[PDB]
């Protein structure tokens, strides 16, 4: 039978009897040298959680886990594929070191257990070679914690593309430094992670429209109609500004992502009804591209300079797919931009005319959102299904094609304080495994959606998942003290730091991870409310915290011990901004700083 492994071999040829792994094994590197490969061994030693440690200065002999890197076997095994033999050692042979982190990755499910494995061999090599998730952190902020977290299932499950849509916090262009964004410190952490883990990062700055994240304080960049009134979320394309612009920000994004990719997004940028309210549209696109051109041309021509700009760089482009519809007769989309396809209807292109553009498609269906306050894709259904890369909105595919690149799913936030981070991580358990069994392609490991959950659920996350300590206070009640202060109710339904205050907080663990802060005296809950929103959520640095009455649905009434220095500060779940004391007042603020507070019973 084959190994219960997820993502399932491609195949396997079992033979009787077992490997058993003891306390003197090695973990043997007897192929090619790679400072990558052994460093991933190391971690790898850990991972499996025994005694076996890497070897140095011998051959490989019965016992060993053998990771040997054959650059030889590349047409045979390609970049990420590998072959795996189980007898009296364990051999996994590969034509990179990411064909040897996947061969590793197999191992730890079959040693899991009991450290014993049924013999046999297989040549595992993926079926599609983009095995995605995409996290949209737009707007509010998901925390590096979730996604190294994330990158470790990820890799266990043999996930390969990270997508992320996020706000690098800029230099280029301080007046879109507004939260949430991540500094370049924490970019490159998470770069440092997908190197780790063999993950690819995509990043996105969404284009032309979709830049309210951006263009805030830039009116003189947002689109104005016939009547000067200005659309916030929108570059006008007519002009040269729009464009540089553009590419300035894109430009410092690829300096600290590093991504062999950009995603520029690139949804429709208005509905056909919207452009004779900027008649600069159509004239540009007269102007530049002849009588017969439409806004669409002009539109597409956006596209197409931003490929220009990314490729003289090294790097090549991504967009959606959803302003591709059939519109642009004058100016063609370049052939060499990668096209997410996730909607369908109307004349948008279907994956089947795409596809015959020669361009690489990957399936991003609308089907395999998770969104927060919203649509939750159907994993059960779609395992049913037997959903496959060929299955896009709108067309199944009969026949396969080697430019569709695969599929990932999507986790957006539109209704962002509806639902905290570790909410969506619970939530996108099955879905992960869920894409990266139809990605990696092998035979389906069960007749059943319950046979395939009971299997996940039974090889769990990836060794050493937790990163964090969610309940490291005790429930009850405590004074919250910084100094002679204590966090109290003060007027006007707030909270401040009150010197010599006696005022305490009932602290409760709640079920996602985090905590609620209630007012021993007045019965009231630690609350964000207050300042701008933005997706509902209280994203304005240095607004007021205060008191509402308690609601288990309030996810802002949620807050994450983050401990450190015999201290704890307080995090907003939904916001991921932390309390503050704001010197003038003594009020408790939310800010990207923090006051540490010190926890006494009371
Ligand atoms: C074009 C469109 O409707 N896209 C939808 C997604 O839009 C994204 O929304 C996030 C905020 O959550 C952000 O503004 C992105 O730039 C934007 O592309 C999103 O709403 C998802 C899920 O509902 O649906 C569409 O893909």
Not at 139 to 168: G, P
Not at 187 to 208: D, G
Not at 214 to 241: C, F, M, T, W
Not at 276 to 304: C, E, M, V, W
Request: hydrophobic residues 35%.
């Amino acid at each position: 039978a084959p190994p219960e492994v997820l993502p399932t071999l491609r195949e396997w040829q079992g033979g009787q009897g077992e490997f058993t792994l003891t306390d003197r094994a090695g973990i043997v590197l007897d192929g090619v040298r790679d400072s990558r490969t052994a460093a991933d061994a190391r971690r790898f030693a850990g991972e499996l959680n025994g005694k076996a440690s890497v070897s140095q200065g011998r051959a490989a002999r019965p016992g060993d886990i053998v990771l040997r890197q054959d650059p030889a076997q590349k047409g045979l095994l390609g970049a990420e594929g590998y072959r795996l033999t189980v007898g009296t050692r364990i051999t996994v042979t590969a034509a990179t070191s990411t064909g040897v982190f996947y061969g590793t990755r197999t191992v730890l499910q079959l040693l899991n257990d009991d450290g014993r494995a049924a013999r046999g061999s297989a040549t595992d090599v993926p079926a599609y070679r983009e095995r995605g998730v995409g996290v949209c952190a737009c707007y509010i902020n998901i925390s590096t914690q979730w996604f190294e977290r994330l990158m470790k299932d990820m890799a266990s499950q043999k996930l390969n593309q990270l997508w992320i849509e996020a706000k690098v916090k800029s230099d280029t262009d301080p007046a879109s430094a507004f939260w949430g964004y991540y500094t370049k410190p924490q970019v490159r952490t998470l770069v440092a992670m997908a190197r780790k883990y063999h993950i690819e990062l995509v990043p996105e700055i969404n284009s032309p429209g979709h830049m309210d994240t951006y263009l805030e304080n830039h009116p003189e960049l947002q689109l104005k109609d016939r009547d000067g009134v200005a659309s916030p979320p929108r570059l006008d394309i007519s002009r040269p500004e729009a464009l540089a612009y553009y590419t300035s920000m894109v430009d410092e994004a690829l300096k600290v992502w590093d991504s062999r990719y950009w995603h520029m997004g690139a949804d429709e940028y208005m509905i056909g009804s919207s452009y004779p309210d900027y008649p600069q549209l159509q004239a540009a696109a007269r102007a530049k591209f002849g009588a017969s051109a439409t806004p669409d041309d002009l539109f597409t021509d956006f596209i197409n300079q931003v490929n220009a700009h990314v490729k003289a760089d090294g790097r090549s482009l991504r967009i959606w797919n959803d302003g591709l519809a059939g519109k642009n007769a004058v100016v063609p989309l370049d052939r060499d931009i990668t096209v997410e396809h996730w909607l369908s209807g109307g004349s948008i292109q279907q994956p089947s005319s795409l596809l015959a553009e020669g361009r690489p498609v990957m399936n991003s269906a609308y089907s395999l959102y998770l969104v927060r306050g919203g649509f939750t894709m159907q994993t059960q259904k779609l395992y049913e299904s037997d959903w496959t890369p060929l299955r896009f909105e709108g067309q199944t595919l009969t026949q396969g094609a080697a430019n569709l690149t695969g599929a990932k799913i999507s986790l957006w936030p539109d209704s962002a304080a509806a639902e905290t981070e570790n909410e969506v991580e619970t939530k996108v358990f099955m879905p992960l495994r869920f894409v990266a069994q139809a990605t990696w392609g092998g035979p389906k490991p069960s007749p059943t959606y319950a046979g395939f959950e009971a299997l996940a659920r039974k090889i769990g996350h990836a060794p050493g998942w937790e990163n964090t300590d969610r309940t490291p206070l005790a429930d009850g009640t405590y004074r919250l003290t910084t100094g002679a202060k204590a966090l109290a109710p003060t007027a006007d339904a707030g909270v401040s730091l009150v010197k010599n205050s006696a005022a305490s907080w009932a602290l409760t663990a709640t079920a996602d991870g985090y905590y609620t802060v209630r007012s021993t005296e007045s019965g009231q809950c630690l609350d964000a409310v207050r300042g701008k929103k933005y997706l509902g959520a209280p994203l304005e640095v240095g607004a007021e915290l205060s008191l509402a009455n308690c609601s288990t649905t309030a996810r802002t009434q949620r807050w994450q011990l983050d401990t450190g220095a015999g201290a704890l500060t307080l995090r907003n779940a939904i916001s991921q901004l932390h309390l503050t004391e704001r010197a003038s007042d003594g009020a408790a603020v939310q800010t990207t700083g923090a006051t540490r507070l010190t926890a006494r019973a009371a």
